Amino acid sequence: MDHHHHHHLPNITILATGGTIAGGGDSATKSNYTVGKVGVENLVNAVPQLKDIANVKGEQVVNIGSQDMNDNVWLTLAKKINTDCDKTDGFVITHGVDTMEETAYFLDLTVKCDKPVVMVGAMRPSTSMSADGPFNLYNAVVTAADKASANRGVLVVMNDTVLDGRDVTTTNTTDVATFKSVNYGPLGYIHNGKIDYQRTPARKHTSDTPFDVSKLNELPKVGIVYNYANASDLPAKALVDAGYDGIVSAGVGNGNLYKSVFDTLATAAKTGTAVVRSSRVPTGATTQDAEVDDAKYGFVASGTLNPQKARVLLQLALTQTKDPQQIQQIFNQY
Amino acid sequence: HHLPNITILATGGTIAGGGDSATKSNYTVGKVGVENLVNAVPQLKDIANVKGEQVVNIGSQDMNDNVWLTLAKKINTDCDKTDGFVITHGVDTMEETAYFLDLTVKCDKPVVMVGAMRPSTSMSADGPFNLYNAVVTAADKASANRGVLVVMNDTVLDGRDVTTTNTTDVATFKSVNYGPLGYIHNGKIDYQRTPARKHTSDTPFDVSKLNELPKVGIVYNYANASDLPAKALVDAGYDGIVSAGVGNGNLYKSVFDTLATAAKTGTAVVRSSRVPTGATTQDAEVDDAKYGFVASGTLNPQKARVLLQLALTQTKDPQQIQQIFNQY
Amino acid sequence: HHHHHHLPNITILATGGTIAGGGDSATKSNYTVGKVGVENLVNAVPQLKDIANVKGEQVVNIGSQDMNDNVWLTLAKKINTDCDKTDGFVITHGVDTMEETAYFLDLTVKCDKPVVMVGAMRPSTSMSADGPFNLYNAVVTAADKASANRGVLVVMNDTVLDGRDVTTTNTTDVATFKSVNYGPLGYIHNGKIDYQRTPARKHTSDTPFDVSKLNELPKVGIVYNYANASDLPAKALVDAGYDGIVSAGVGNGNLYKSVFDTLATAAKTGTAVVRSSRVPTGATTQDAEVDDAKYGFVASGTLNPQKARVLLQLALTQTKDPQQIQQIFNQY
Amino acid sequence: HHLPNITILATGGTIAGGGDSATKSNYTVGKVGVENLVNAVPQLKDIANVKGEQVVNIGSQDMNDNVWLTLAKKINTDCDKTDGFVITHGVDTMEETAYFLDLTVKCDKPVVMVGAMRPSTSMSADGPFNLYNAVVTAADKASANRGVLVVMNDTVLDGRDVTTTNTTDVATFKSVNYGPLGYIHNGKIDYQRTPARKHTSDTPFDVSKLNELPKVGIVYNYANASDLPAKALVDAGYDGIVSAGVGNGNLYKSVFDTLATAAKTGTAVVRSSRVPTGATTQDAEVDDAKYGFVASGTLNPQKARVLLQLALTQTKDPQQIQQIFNQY
Ligand SMILES: NC(=O)C[C@H](N)C(=O)O
Ligand SMILES: NC(=O)C[C@H](N)C(=O)O
Ligand SMILES: NC(=O)C[C@H](N)C(=O)O
Ligand SMILES: NC(=O)C[C@H](N)C(=O)O
Ligand SMILES: [Mg+2]
Secondary structure, eight states: OOSSOOOOOOEEEEEEEESGGGOBOSOSSOOOOBSSOSOHHHHHHTOGGGGGTOEEEEEEEEEEOGGGOOHHHHHHHHHHHHHHGGGOSEEEEEOOSTTHHHHHHHHHHHOOOOSOEEEEOOSSOTTSTTOSHHHHHHHHHHHHTOGGGTTSOSEEEETTEEEETTTEEEOBSSOTTOEEETTTOOSEEEETTEEEEOOOOOSOOGGGSOOOOTTOSOOOOEEEEEOOTTOOSHHHHHHHHTTOSEEEEEEBTTTBOOHHHHHHHHHHHHTTOEEEEEESSSBSOBOSSSSSOHHHHTEEEOBTOOHHHHHHHHHHHHTTOOOHHHHHHHHHHO | OOSOEEEEEEEESGGGOEESSSSOOOEEOSOSOHHHHHHTOGGGGGTOEEEEEEEEEEOGGGOOHHHHHHHHHHHHHHGGGOSEEEEEOOSTTHHHHHHHHHHHOOOOSOEEEEOOSSOTTSTTOSHHHHHHHHHHHHHOGGGTTSOSEEEETTEEEETTTEEEOBSSOTTOEEETTTOOSEEEETTEEEEOOOOOSOOGGGSOOOOTTOSSOOOEEEEEOOTTOOSHHHHHHHHTTOSEEEEEEBTTTBOOHHHHHHHHHHHTTTOEEEEEESSSBSOBOSSSSOOHHHHTEEEOBTOOHHHHHHHHHHHTTTOOOHHHHHHHHHHO | OOOOOOOOEEEEEEEESGGGOEESSSSOOOEEOSOSOHHHHHHTOGGGGGTOEEEEEEEEEEOGGGOOHHHHHHHHHHHHHHGGGOSEEEEEOOSTTHHHHHHHHHHHOOOOSOEEEEOOSSOTTSTTOSHHHHHHHHHHHHHOGGGTTSOSEEEETTEEEETTTEEEOBSSOTTOEEETTTOOSEEEETTEEEEOOOOOSOOGGGSOOOOTTOSOOOOEEEEEOOTTOOSHHHHHHHHTTOSEEEEEEBTTTBOOHHHHHHHHHHHHHTOEEEEEESSSBSOBOSSSSOOHHHHTEEEOBTOOHHHHHHHHHHHHHHOOOHHHHHHHHHHO | OOOOEEEEEEEESGGGOBOSOTTSOOOBSOOSOHHHHHHTOGGGGGTOEEEEEEEEEEOGGGOOHHHHHHHHHHHHHHGGGOSEEEEEOOSTTHHHHHHHHHHHOOOOSOEEEEOOSSOTTSTTOSHHHHHHHHHHHHHOGGGTTSOSEEEETTEEEETTTEEEOBSSOTTOEEETTTOOSEEEETTEEEEOOOOOSOOGGGSOOOOTTOSSOOOEEEEEOOTTOOSHHHHHHHHTTOSEEEEEEBTTTBOOHHHHHHHHHHHHHTOEEEEEESSSBSOBOSSSSOOHHHHTEEEOBTOOHHHHHHHHHHHTTTOOOHHHHHHHHHHO
């Protein structure tokens, strides 16, 4: 019989992928830096207070700028998380900000582990005055260690805020406060190492999706084309000529397409290419029942998913189905 | 005779649109003529003598260089015949046309763009009061010398910074980096700001005898981005390419490789960002000098395209193009 | 059906020193001492958690130039009482009198588990501060099972030094600590120690010195010898009834005549008198120029004056007979 | 070829000692005279015309101010009658006599001190060759103007930095901070250094009329140090006190308090260190200027005593004493 208890700190695994969080330059003050050149051990050791909140173990997955994120790394991450779920209490992924909102959503759809998975980055390199990385990493570990964080999907933690992987996006090129869930808001705020969660995502995620990438070595090919005045149809045609499985249109306004672009995508859809209309506009849904007769052309409306997120869901949809009506149902549920 | 003379130049948009009913979110664009738009707001007679001309009647998703050239040449030619201009237009590409005119209009009389998120037929249609406030703005002598303006949702916005921020909200138009110039209340404007970037008669861009513009395309960056869009533009001999980069203008490695080649082979390359606010800067991760790339600053990709097209009427030299991107 | 990784439990007993000091900039040389608490020193080296389960206790927070018998007694009693409650001890301390504390504990600690002393020549706030890595290596040493049964140790500048022979050799050099007669026990590289030596003199649980019930130690002072030396210092210790006097002699423990005269008198009155030397290396021997048995004096051997004071104080807890004190100085 | 006239001034020491056995350690100092020592090294006739004078015959543990005065006066008076001096002396306080002479000798001709760790009767006794090498050094014209020297174990050492480092080793004498001046091999010296601190004829210390020196005592610091030694020197009215401090010149609190009070009464107080190498610095843990204390630099406590006594023949102002300790 024990006569007293002791507090046990959770085991948290850090999966490091690079990013400005791991970036460095030669001056504390100059803006120039190189990404992904500092290892995970260095990041942990720069936050000596992590020992107060978790038993941390670091693993270097890759060390890249997130501008070079790709399908291979996504599959690696999802499989590692799903395989290693039973071995830890939670995960933190250090990652670049530039495509964090894509990876987070991919993982939000493909992770099956029911322990928290928290992504984190930094807007200033590790070497800069007032670098944001250390406290962001601390708060990410706080979030991954909180029992309340489970069953909320894959999270992003930046600037004292817990954000869901589906709605989160980077809103500013340089500001440390850039990450916002611009349609539906954050889940919780962090103060003094404690989170007050007031929201959770209603769209199905993680173990409630059908997307199972455990055996996959590649993902369906999906490209993104931009719309604007006098838009060339040559980007769309190039993707069609290469046999792309899907194309997402970054439309103008509520997902509208320049006529040339429309014409190429209509034609492609008729031959079986999947075509999703999203929007270059930074907030709001690309809706059904506006100026485009989606049913007639075999197009899908992306809802609040921006083009790059729409790409993520469409690649996954394409592992299950090629039928536009079933792909629309997916875009209505995940 | 005591009121200003204001010319409406109509191009279409949902402001000139039409629904099957008041609630139905389904609607046709650019179908009402300018005369019907003016006549639907009889209170315009309280504030201006309004004359309307139809330029085109299209959805702004189909806006093109030919319409832009038409508009600038018309405004420049007719400047002396009127006191102010209001341009009715679609929302979708208003931010592009506004900036093109901001750079090519030489009249320093007010030029004010306006649109609507809802057609006239819808409940609580936004177009009537928007049109009224646009005419108020074009009639205000304080609106002069501020560049080309967009007036939406009781706000006056400069054509360089203004952009649409939401796919359906009547309050979509915002100057997301530097803020609005003034707010409109009870038919009056309190202007507290003006753009510092050179505009209108302070730019060298002269489109009076141009019938076409240099070819400039936009490629998007994302994880695992294909280089095929960029290669298709290079293969067609595009004069320039704007990159909608990730974060602070960054490029996916395959796209970076193609654009790096393009910049040495006769294509001007501008790095902009898919991120909705903030500058694409120099002196971050990309050595622009080494590659011959230009950084867009606060110009988003579609606006960077506008400025690159016009730069390429003057020069192909990346240093000179960067200096243009630092002044306008 | 399952194994669990475990790290040694190490207790850090803090006493102050420049290791716990501070200055007003990274470059200036004027340091405060004994200002930072143990928790703050430990927190500053997060890598400690990967080699040990560390707990810290503040004993005092002083400059070691003010170290005294009361702190010595506290340290020995604490280590002896808590031996069964940890796997090893590190003591943070000033450099100035480290060599004295180390030898006192070497004689009075009865735990055979590692006891490792550590300090710094610079505070944490100075450029290239030595304390963080010094602390790290001290914990590496205390956690190494090979460090047991070697007596009390001092770990400085990647070197493990025995508490009997270790001394500070330079006023400012980070490499000051050396075992100047017999050498170090081992060197530390990449968190591992290659021990090649151990002290042969009896230490720790092989000594008879038991301070567990003592509130105070016998009074022992030190007098310096030099040309024309005054006998007044020696006279002042005699007049106060000191239990012992150590001579910091010239050369091989020799005394200026007037100091000699005072101490020869004192020895016959029952004051214990130890000849040591101001010379920094080598033994103060018998059978040179002084007939120790005639005068009733003890020769210190390789013990320098301040170390000889430590042993004499302890000897005086057992005995006042010069022959017996000499045998103590031949064994410990 | 003419041999230099060298004078040997003998003071005693183990070099002049003897015991009953070649192979036991017991000996007494001064069993032999200077004539005996000279005649035991007939090889000296190869290199110098040697004359011996016995000044005293003591163990250097009993060296005192009166012998120092006698030595300096003798050297300064007899400088013109000879080409160089060798002083045979005990090891124990050689480093004090050498520095006293380094500051008070005005003769620029060589003055070389020498002793032995083993008595003359010992197997492998070091004194014969030591004496030979000291006469070599005194006979070398290159030895002039280097200050008073100590020659032991084939090494020429300056009087300021030289100290005995080991209780028994024949190689004990070292210049522990700044190194030797030269090494001797086959009767020849390669000098590569000379002391920069002012010595001999470049000091103001003139002892020619003095028959006593200011009273200066030395107190030791250690854990739980008694203030009683310090208080005794204060109560006797000592002119100066040197502290053998711990580490970089630090003092035990009760010793510090005694000396702080003494300094305000006018006693000169120098902080030195028991630590065998390195300077006792200013700008560490003690505010010397506040207390009226002087930092000794590289001077050990016994050497600091030498310079303090001499300073006190000129001044008792602590600022001026510090300037002396910075120059000599
Ligand atoms: N702030 C950042 O992390 C930007 C970096 N280019 C990345 O996404 O890896
Ligand atoms: N509200 C609008 O005006 C949208 C329409 N597609 C346009 O831009 O012409
Ligand atoms: N470096 C040091 O620790 C010197 C300090 N005076 C001490 O012994 O406490
Ligand atoms: N070796 C020596 O000369 C030691 C002797 N006690 C002396 O200094 O006179
Ligand atoms: Mg317990």
